[model samples]
Target: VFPLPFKIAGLGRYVPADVVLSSDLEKKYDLPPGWCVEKQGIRERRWVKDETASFMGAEAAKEAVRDAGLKLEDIDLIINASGSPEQAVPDGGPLVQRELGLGRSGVPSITVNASCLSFFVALDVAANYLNMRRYKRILIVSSDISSVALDFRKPENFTLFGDAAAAAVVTLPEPGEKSCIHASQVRTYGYGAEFSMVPGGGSRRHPNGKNTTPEDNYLHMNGAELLKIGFEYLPRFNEALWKQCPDITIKDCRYVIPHQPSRVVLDYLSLTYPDDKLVRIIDRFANCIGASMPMALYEAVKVGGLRRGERGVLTGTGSGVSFVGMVFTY
Candidate 1:
């Protein structure tokens, strides 16, 4: 048997204070009450009140640390995966590091961005650290407040996002521990990058002091194109992951955790897999960008949808046309 490189020690998640129901958005935008419900399976989503992404990340990190049976000082590194940071100066890493009291120099920290695939990419990096024996324990935290960046007047963009944070403690496995991260894969198509992005923020729009148009700043998703891509690629992503573990089959997977984009996306993908194997959290949590997949994983384990010795599939797709797939035995 191949030895698993790392094990998941603990998990935690945090949602914002305010809750906005689908009806709220429907009335605000004068859309159908069942629009988000039918399309995204989003009934309600959490909204933060002037809260920064780093702060939300820190909150989730604390719980994960506690669950891991370790103090803040015990960690060797903290990885904050966020597409939205309070500012470009310090980045979200140092901010979360300071708030969690991880001390300045000892516990090194950094931030990574791969749009919605940030956490999965962060996990790949952290796994390498564990394999090298450079770090005994590492914290992976992901958060996004997409609602703040969205144009509320646009039904398609505004109704699909929510603010949330999630964290997991990854550590070297103890002797005889059964858990293992079997395999992971990340693929990106740069040509499709323009399909979704905030166009006028960085060097491209700087020096002019010019603000972006309403459509430029808000999420610009080509829904039809996105659906086509998701459907075509997801099966292959799963197929590749299945090859990594010849011992497991699609039926062996206890749960499939996907990025909560919408109900339609989830249902459409579910057709590719067996019934009851797919976990749907979008109805309550909405699209939390990077946090959705991990949050679904945590919830499945907590509620007994996932049990030890059973395999799991975690997949995410981002605007950069980036797709990530991983298979783990819990």
Candidate 2:
């Protein structure tokens, strides 16, 4: 847990132009009529036709900068927080930098990737620099193209993912502004590392190697097993979180922005918070991998979901079986 002083200044999001509704998918895939909506609660989601992950990430970055009431030069750092990289050789950060025309602007860029929790992780990292006054403004962007390699035969991956990108401008809060000292947590259990992953693209099975199988590159998961493990550890995770930041518990927060796993897992979270206290976006946007949390955070802020002095929590689980929670006082 690293406590820092920082505040979210602006937020932006970008979804692909093409829309894929649950009904459309059901007809194409021959799934039950109400399967997606009833089981996953995903009515519709965006699908990228001609967009690269970095390009959309950069588009969101520009809007976040404009919303922050600042120009591109004001940001001292760019943090591209993605669930998966657009390419293996060049990192997503620098590619996003090029799209923003900051490739030659000399603004340093880095990435904080923890799968679905990447946005929360990046915000925590950005806050530390702001506290040190080393950077007055920082840009955090997240994007995921889960649609690219989804194995449609797998129901878990088939019914639940979307392509999306989101960005936020983080800065030192001015006096009387909605900024407060930080409280956050990140926990990883490597034993369940394979709970969710693609078995290829690494040294173990290089994508270009002659021995690599076609299935190696597609997304794979045992949804039932992963869900069981996540639910088992969730209570312990929350207990430790309350210990780290006592006052930032469920009783104190105004709303929660979660990872958008599924409507089922969210029901467990609902047991702790009332319906209105949760920022629910999965039904509309589906799971944008790491982009889900920040995009939901932006939606909450733009619609005045929280007042100036209200508090909110950003929390989620990632593929590494990672759990991250950060409390923000708005």
Candidate 3:
């Protein structure tokens, strides 16, 4: 009722140390010198060596807690948006909670898995939690270590992903500052779920099957099919989103931070909203999955691209052909 009742109080990100340059990839994959650079605009990406997904998520949680000027004990909830986890039993959320010293008693934590759209879904959940006065401050963190599933020798998958983490403190707005998630939507098409997924090791397939192979753990993508789906669904979603926000137009959006799948996806969206101003960070970070959107959001705020009273859109389509879009006014 009261404008969804929450604002982003803080933001932070953590990127891994091992940097893989485009030149290195070219030599390994026999890709042309400028092929990746020209097409995806990616020059380098971060690869985690000894770090687990939960570790990166914890680092981001520390930074977000610091940004909020609150102690870890003050956080009422923790939501981790990630597909990869350090363990199968506890999930990454509790792992991160213990690592960050947030403990398990006072604050409850959980993981949200919607592939790349997990962050938006997590945010939506936190927004509802705040609106109901269920929590005072919620820490939403998203991190993915795609490198774990990558075969560095495979150019198609290797060059398109990077490992990173991002976080935000969602809480009630301050006196006159009106930044909040104004309107949002999520859609899913179950038919496309298998198009991009880890095939084996789950209950349905199981590791003991004769069909199971080591390659099943590797990331598989139908690039052309994904591109077709993106072009078909994204523009229509944006059009409907714009109609929902009457006071805002494509031009009013300070930045359009779509999921950083590749330069092609960003470029496609740019052409779709030809007149809108968009900011992109994929050239440097590649696709960090759910973290990608929040990382872009942090970059925009850091560089003054988003200002007080400015509005922006964060959108993405994940493995389920799941589309999530949210408009934020700052």
Report backbone clashes per prediction: 2, 0, 1
Q: Mind giving the per-residue lDDT tens digits that candidate 3 earns over 149-206?
A: 7766566677878889999989988878877776788888776666787786576557
Model 1 ranges off by over 4 Å: 1-3, 207-214, 228-236
- Taking all chains together, each candidate's TM-score versus the true structure is 0.91, 0.93, 0.92
Candidate 2: clashing pairs of residues? none
- Which portions of model 2 show Cα errors greater than 4 Å? 1-3, 208-214
lDDT scores for all predictions? 0.79, 0.83, 0.79
> Model 3 TM-score?
0.92
Q: What value does the lDDT take at residue 288 in candidate 3? A: 81
Give the per-residue lDDT of model 1 (tens digit) for 164-232: 899989997787776777768888877677777767657765536565454454566676787677677
